[PDB]
Amino acid sequence: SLNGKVIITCAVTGAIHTPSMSPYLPVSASEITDAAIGAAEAGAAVIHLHARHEGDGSPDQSVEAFNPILGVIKQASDAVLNITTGGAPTMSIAERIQPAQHYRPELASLNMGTMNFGLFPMLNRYESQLKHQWERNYLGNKDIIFRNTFGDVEHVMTTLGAGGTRFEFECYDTSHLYNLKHFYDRGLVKGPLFIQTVFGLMGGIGAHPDDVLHMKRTADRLFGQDYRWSVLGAGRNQLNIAAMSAAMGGHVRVGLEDNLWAGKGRLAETNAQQVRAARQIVEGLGLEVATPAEARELLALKGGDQVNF
Amino acid sequence: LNGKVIITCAVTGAIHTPSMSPYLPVSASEITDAAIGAAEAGAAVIHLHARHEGDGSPDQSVEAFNPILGVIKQASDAVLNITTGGAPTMSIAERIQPAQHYRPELASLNMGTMNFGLFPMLNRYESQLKHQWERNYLGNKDIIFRNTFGDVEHVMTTLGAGGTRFEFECYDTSHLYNLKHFYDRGLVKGPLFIQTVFGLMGGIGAHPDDVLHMKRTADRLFGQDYRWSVLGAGRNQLNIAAMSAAMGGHVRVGLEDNLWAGKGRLAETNAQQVRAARQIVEGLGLEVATPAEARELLALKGGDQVNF
Amino acid sequence: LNGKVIITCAVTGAIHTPSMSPYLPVSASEITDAAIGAAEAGAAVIHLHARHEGDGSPDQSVEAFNPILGVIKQASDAVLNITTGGAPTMSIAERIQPAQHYRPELASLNMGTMNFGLFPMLNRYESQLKHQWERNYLGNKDIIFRNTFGDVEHVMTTLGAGGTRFEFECYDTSHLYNLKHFYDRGLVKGPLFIQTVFGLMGGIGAHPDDVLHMKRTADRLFGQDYRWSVLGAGRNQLNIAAMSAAMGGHVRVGLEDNLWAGKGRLAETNAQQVRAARQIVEGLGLEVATPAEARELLALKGGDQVNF
Amino acid sequence: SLNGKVIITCAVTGAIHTPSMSPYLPVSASEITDAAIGAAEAGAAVIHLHARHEGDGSPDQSVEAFNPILGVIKQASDAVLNITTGGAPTMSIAERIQPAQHYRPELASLNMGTMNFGLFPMLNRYESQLKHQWERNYLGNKDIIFRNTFGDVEHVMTTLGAGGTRFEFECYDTSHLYNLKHFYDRGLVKGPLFIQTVFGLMGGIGAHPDDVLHMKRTADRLFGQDYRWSVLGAGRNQLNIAAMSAAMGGHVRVGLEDNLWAGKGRLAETNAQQVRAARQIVEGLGLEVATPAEARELLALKGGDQVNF
Ligand SMILES: CC(=O)SCCNC(=O)CCNC(=O)[C@H](O)C(C)(C)COP(=O)(O)OP(=O)(O)OC[C@H]1O[C@@H](n2cnc3c(N)ncnc32)[C@H](O)[C@@H]1OP(=O)(O)O
Ligand SMILES: CC(=O)SCCNC(=O)CCNC(=O)[C@H](O)C(C)(C)COP(=O)(O)OP(=O)(O)OC[C@H]1O[C@@H](n2cnc3c(N)ncnc32)[C@H](O)[C@@H]1OP(=O)(O)O
Ligand SMILES: CC(=O)SCCNC(=O)CCNC(=O)[C@H](O)C(C)(C)COP(=O)(O)OP(=O)(O)OC[C@H]1O[C@@H](n2cnc3c(N)ncnc32)[C@H](O)[C@@H]1OP(=O)(O)O
Ligand SMILES: CC(=O)SCCNC(=O)CCNC(=O)[C@H](O)C(C)(C)COP(=O)(O)OP(=O)(O)OC[C@H]1O[C@@H](n2cnc3c(N)ncnc32)[C@H](O)[C@@H]1OP(=O)(O)O
Ligand SMILES: [Zn+2]
Ligand SMILES: [Zn+2]
Ligand SMILES: [Zn+2]
Ligand SMILES: [Zn+2]
């Protein structure tokens, strides 16, 4: 019965885009919860969550920052809440791990390799618009290392896994799939693996169709039937890559964390706006958007009532 | 024109038979109704076969298109694309006669000789076949769709003289290489309307790797001098259409290629499949090409410079 | 057997003609000398055609192999692989007669109907063609190598009854899918000796992406139940052989497939191409398969259980 | 005339393998120079060089460590000398850059992205054989980050480029090709680009034929005709991947830096042994091994007489 069900994840704000880039980027806790609830009611079964300082909008990966967010969304929606362990790519593991460790979510992101994270491409378009000094230092930083060593990843699996949390394994290139294979063969994570292949980041693999098929092909060969595929296309590749995945039996992620645009010369005003576009592609293919309960079964999650919020 | 997707609708064809679906257009008026509805739903190109109204069998004669082409033209400015293949069991200088006489903007052109397999189609439909010609057709394990190098060279010369440009039908890698041979000799000038056909028994399959392989090969052989369209047979129709739309290509739908809408549900109109492809195209943030935009992308002569 | 590479040598074939090279074996004794030298250089399988000694044209009769098979068998324990294709312009129940009568361990089996293009070969050789049949053959733009689904099913049944296993000749993706159809019906049992042929006009090209595409497709359709061999036409012979050897596959060489040794240099013997492939195989740290190791990898009946 | 010429690089010792793994790993300066000269006389046009402490064989990336190596090889051979800027993957950029900066070689390696570097797979086979404590700490370290940020890479290009040195761009995955494309489009390096795609490392892309074709395909699309392709296959993939490259118009790297084995149950005794095997594949294909002078033309190098040793 779960055949032909597509899971839409909506990543509502993230840590990469900054407030000066768009007035529609959710910053406050109430903006983030409204964006999440609106996206779930449009058909997002999973909400991927970051938090921000309400003062200047900078990334906030503290336990307290999620307190006015998680419980509010849960009361209003049964969507699966996916808490970031990535935060801002400049953060340490000790900092990034605390929210998921405390709240024991059904799902948490797990980044699978250390990589350069380049943001200066966003300086070409946005430098003159930046209003906060932290935005200038952040996007100008040519030395960002998004740290996820083999020791880090093993520690996160062990720590968060004890609380029943399952992972969205974020894979930005082929090597991250091989890294995941290493832990999968050691039995440190069990199937079905929720593998998200991320396309178009500076420091990661590109967004060419060859890149998509290569990651899909590699995942197929390394993990067979024991994984569920999701994709993330950055910027204007968002909907193109979501459609490829939906057409190939995979799942999709949209959201203002990854793309600020709704069309040509047009910024996206809400996260739900992007969920509806993906949903239109899903239903045009003759498929159906998965409910949260259907996502929990496809991904083997512990249930929205087994969390600490 | 950068974000415009041409939807071609093939309304009846010659592979499916009337016993397979009551919605398959057969009579001339059913074909014209199907074509006009598909155009109004957003199909810029209509791909056309004719059939004998008696038993529904393929009819590739000149007169068969007479009550079809003019009727559609009067009601729509869609590009009319006349088959030169017909049923895969037919000859050449005769197969090109409809397009030769009517001088359409577009004609299909199959790029290689291949086996055509339909006897698995017999597995499910054998019970409900009404006409004897359907049983012989589908049970035939010796169908050869003939398109020799000499045949293809003849079509390009003969039909090119009428101002007709071609939709190059490519069912496997060899057909792209066959097209590269003629392209290099200058027998066809760009932009090439290359249609890669997936899922037929006797052709390449419909796996996503098959799609990317044909795309990569076309990119390497023809660069920027071609326009890519896809045809996904049967249940692969919309999946492969979505891949193409997402990769900068164009899409073909229609009851010639797929009789099914969902699970155990037959498609009732061609327009219904056009609407689905259109929903995908627009969900992607793209727009469906008008007939006028298709004519520019494909370098066609105009819907008023034909012989009908 | 894990690091053993089967070298097949195709000593003369039916595509090249005698005016193209004085080293192309024609007479029966030239073919047997070529086969024995290739086996002694390390070729475990010898792939065989016969020719008329009068003008060098293909000869696919039963008697044509009589002074060939027994001579080779007496001098070598190589696996003898008899063509069922002959010249691409030939019929079926007759084409299978040599293999039907002699009941070899191996027979070739072409898996699809395709165009065969040789008129570009005419570009360079037209000046030096001695026999009229060479000019008509190479200039023919209408060659159709016929292998319908019904034809192939007939060969599998008829020749399978003699204990003969097949080398499935696959010239494009569709031929692997065609083979998958018969494999699923149980008409051929593994391990399948699948030979992917690259570089022919009418088939897939010889680009590295073409090689990987055929390999990927075969892996997905047949898994571990097949043995992969490659044939790179002309100048691609050793490049594609090296890719296969490096990827766990097997290699085919021979003057049937390539007349050239280097730049403007004709290959003088089949053994010479076998030695080259062997140098590559051993440079990789692998070993060339003996005939006895080939028989185990391919599940053959034995060189003494034949009718010659 | 340079058509059909294959460049063989021989990497004689490296920094990854350790002395306890094989008694044939060159350690002393005289062992390294003998290995280099023997490999060049077998047909290696380029020698890729690391140095080691003669005491315990640990990696030595000091300027002084190359002093008894470079001049000795140059006097005995006209091979192109390729000095590592990678050193041991635990080293900083300030340390790793000094040899190439001082000696101004024709060629230096340039690693194109930050990555995990996993060596514990080598602990499964070798742990009981290790004789030095530094070997145990090194191979057991699950937290190795091979640092090559965008800022680092730009700095190395600028610094070493002023001395006429050209680069072997070491690419361990698709993202490193995209990283190189970024600098190539900014004009910070000029063609022909010597791009080496590295296969089989833990933390990098694997050694499956699909991985090889993917990297080749991506390089083709991003750089067209303006690059020269070399490959490195780790361990027992060394000769397989060298053959694929040679068959596809690329160049090859062998050496005990990457593979300790000559066959089944047989350690390789010399670097030249591996050069001869690759040469046998090259000549079996009907191609020819490039001379040093031919390598200098294919790679646009400044000449062996324009170095500071
Ligand atoms: C650790 C973690 O949490 S990792 C999370 C993963 N997310 C990320 O890292 C962020 C991903 N996204 C990004 O990095 C940024 O959005 C970027 C850098 C890709 C944005 O790049 P930009 O060049 O500014 O934007 P992009 O090219 O994607 O889209 C804007 C352009 O596309 C156009 N566009 C957008 N949608 C459409 C459409 N549907 N049709 C036509 N044009 C469109 C816009 O009009 C604009 O055109 P312009 O360049 O002429 O003005
Ligand atoms: C030279 C020339 O003339 S070329 C013309 C180009 N076109 C052609 O040649 C014809 C192309 N089409 C065909 O050949 C035929 O449609 C075929 C052979 C592909 C049909 O194959 P079949 O096996 O009969 O059907 P197929 O499996 O593709 O689709 C029907 C099945 O899929 C299911 N299905 C199809 N779409 C959906 C959907 N969106 N959701 C759920 N189920 C679906 C149906 O319910 C049915 O289920 P079943 O397999 O359990 O019966
Ligand atoms: C069903 C059946 O019967 S199937 C049997 C399977 N085999 C076949 O069908 C036949 C396969 N072979 C052929 O068709 C022919 O050999 C052909 C058509 C490929 C030959 O093509 P041609 O264009 O004549 O030759 P090709 O370019 O491949 O090789 C000769 C050229 O390459 C050069 N060349 C070949 N190898 C080398 C080398 N190692 N080094 C340098 N140059 C070389 C030659 O010097 C010559 O140079 P040129 O192109 O400037 O003249
Ligand atoms: C920063 C820089 O400088 S980066 C430089 C790049 N270099 C590197 O990073 C190092 C690359 N290499 C390595 O990492 C290591 O050599 C490793 C981890 C790959 C070695 O892995 P291992 O499993 O120990 O060895 P590997 O599997 O490659 O080869 C050994 C096995 O292959 C077998 N083998 C080797 N060659 C052959 C052959 N030709 N035929 C058959 N078997 C063979 C051996 O007999 C052995 O078999 P066994 O496992 O049954 O004992
Ligand atoms: Zn995130
Ligand atoms: Zn048609
Ligand atoms: Zn043959
Ligand atoms: Zn090195």
Author numbering:
A (entry chain A), D (entry chain A): 2 to 310
B (entry chain B), C (entry chain B): 3 to 310
Paper excerpt:
Each active site also exhibits only one entry channel for both substrates that appears fully occupied upon acetyl-CoA binding. The surface representation of acetyl-CoA highlights the complete occupancy of the entry channel. After the reaction has taken place, formyl-CoA is released before acetoacetate can leave the active site. This hypothesis is further corroborated by the observation that acetoacetate is an inhibitor for the reaction with MSA and acetyl-CoA. However, we also observed that the enzyme was inhibited by its product acetoacetate with a half-maximal inhibitory concentration (IC50) of 1.45 ± 0.16 mM. Substrate labeling is shown in yellow for acetyl-CoA (“ACO”) and acetoacetate (“AAE”) and in dark grey for CoA (“COA”) and malonate (“MLI”). Earlier studies had proposed R254 as a catalytic base involved in the reaction. However, our structures with bound CoA-ester prompted us to revisit the nature of the catalytic base and suggest a different mechanism for the reaction with MSA, in which E171 acts as the catalytic base (discussed in more detail in Supplementary Note 2). Replacing E171 by leucine abolished BKACE activity, while substitution by a chemically similar but shorter aspartate still showed basal activity (5% of the wild type), supporting the role of E171 in catalysis.
